[PDB]
């Protein structure tokens, strides 16, 4: 309770009742994990969709297959991506350590006068994150099975 | 009396050119039962024609006679081509529903509508019952009106298929 993840098609969806008889610490951990998965999956789905048919970097001929492309990427690029993500994650940890801390709010929304519009847009973020969570796993599975990218699989 | 009953709607409102219920309002319930009966049979007939146009059942109609469902035409020729045993079973089923399952009339020879019932309330307990009075009246009016349009249409299809052999007239 106190969150904004509930929606119309499923209501307050918790069949197995993880949040039931759970601490606010565990609830905040769950919502942080949910939003992180949603955001990373948005990035993944958009990356596969765009890089399938438009990949000018790295000579313009790296494989459109998502699973082959990351192996083709040089080691330094992977190291830099890991460094960037870790540098975001240390700030995530510090935001968790802060006294005021909503789970996924790096923006510090609590200091401003927010309303149901802000709640609805947080719900939009969360719903798109759920859809992208399913989408990214689907795309990777199809890439492993067929060896084609998303848009080439659709072709 | 009769001017405000289910059916006194539409462009005509109450419509008695040859004054049937005006002369004999007591017979209005019998007439309503007959109208519902003919309307329902015609809805079934019109849907049967329209759906036999494009969809036909699979398998043989009668394996002994080597008559297949697709071999039959769409019209009176199909009922002609059904084997005699099929026609007898059809009559038996229709008679069973007419006499026992859905009894439109109570008794004697000149059958009256059942006492504790509507003119054409033939279904048993397991049937859709509307409890909203407005919706009940509206949908009973829809029933009788669709029945009327269906019998006009079904007479049209029957005459067209008698003249030509196809219920669809050219045009």
């Amino acid at each position: 309770n106190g969150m904004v993840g509930d929606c119309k098609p499923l209501g307050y969806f918790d069949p197995l009742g993880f949040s039931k008889d759970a601490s606010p610490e565990t609830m905040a951990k769950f919502r942080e994990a949910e939003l992180k998965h949603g955001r990373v999956a948005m990035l993944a789905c958009a990356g596969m969709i765009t890089a399938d048919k438009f990949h000018p970097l790295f000579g313009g001929k790296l494989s459109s297959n998502p699973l082959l492309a990351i192996t083709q990427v040089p080691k330094l690029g992977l190291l830099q991506i890991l460094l960037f993500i870790g540098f975001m994650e240390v700030f995530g940890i510090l935001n968790s350590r802060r006294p005021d801390y909503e789970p996924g709010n790096f923006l510090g929304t609590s200091q401003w006068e927010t309303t149901p519009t802000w709640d609805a847009y947080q719900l939009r973020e969360l719903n798109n994150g759920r859809l992208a969570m399913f989408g990214a796993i689907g795309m990777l599975t199809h890439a492993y099975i067929t060896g084609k990218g998303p848009l080439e699989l659709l072709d | 009396g009769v001017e405000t009953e289910l059916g006194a709607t539409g462009p005509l409102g109450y419509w008695d050119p040859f004054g049937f219920s005006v002369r004999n309002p007591e017979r209005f319930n019998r007439y309503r039962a007959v109208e519902l009966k003919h309307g329902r049979i015609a809805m079934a007939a019109t849907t049967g024609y329209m759906v036999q146009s494009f969809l036909r059942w699979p398998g043989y109609l009668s394996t002994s006679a080597n008559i297949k469902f697709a071999d039959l035409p769409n019209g009176i020729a199909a009922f002609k081509a059904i084997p005699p045993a099929g026609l007898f079973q059809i009559l038996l089923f229709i008679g069973a529903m007419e006499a026992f399952t859905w009894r439109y009339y109570e008794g004697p020879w000149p059958g009256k509508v059942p006492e504790g019932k509507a003119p054409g309330d033939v279904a048993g307990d397991l049937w859709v019952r509307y409890t909203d009075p407005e919706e009940k009246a509206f949908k009973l009016n829809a029933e009788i009106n669709n029945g009327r349009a269906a019998m006009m249409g079904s007479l049209g299809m029957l005459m067209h298929d008698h003249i030509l052999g196809t219920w669809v007239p050219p045009g």
Binding site: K8, G11, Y12, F13, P15 | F54, L126, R129, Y130
Partner: protein, 168 residues
Amino acid sequence: LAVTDLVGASTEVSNKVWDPLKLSENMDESNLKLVRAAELKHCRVAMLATVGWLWTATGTHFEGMLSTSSGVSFADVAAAGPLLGAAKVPAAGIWQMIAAIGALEVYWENKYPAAECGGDFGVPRVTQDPAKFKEIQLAELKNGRLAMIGIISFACAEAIPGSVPFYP
């Protein structure tokens, strides 16, 4: 709602709520109604799917062209089979079907929400006696449970050879 309150406790399991894994022990009223709505939607879709599979497998199909542009006939789709016929259907037709079903589901979710109304979209009622209506609800759930099992059995029987022996 306690799970014992909902209709579905079958005679085939001694008139007790059947939860081997205790999935609904930690479930709320809204969540339980949502899960029942999902159960009933699956039941109804599986019933219709079983009838459609029987029709197309026995060869029932319309007389015409499903698409003049692609030259795909109802006979062409049906002759391939219940499973490969779906692949042979034009993609645009599949999208029309999905769009219509989605429009109806959006409208019925807005008018009759799953959480507030558990698989009760407000269609007319065949009986008003509570005992009879509970019996019809139980009959619906049983028929649709068997329909889910049947349609999945048909799919695996046709996909993998000889999975189901009595698959007609």
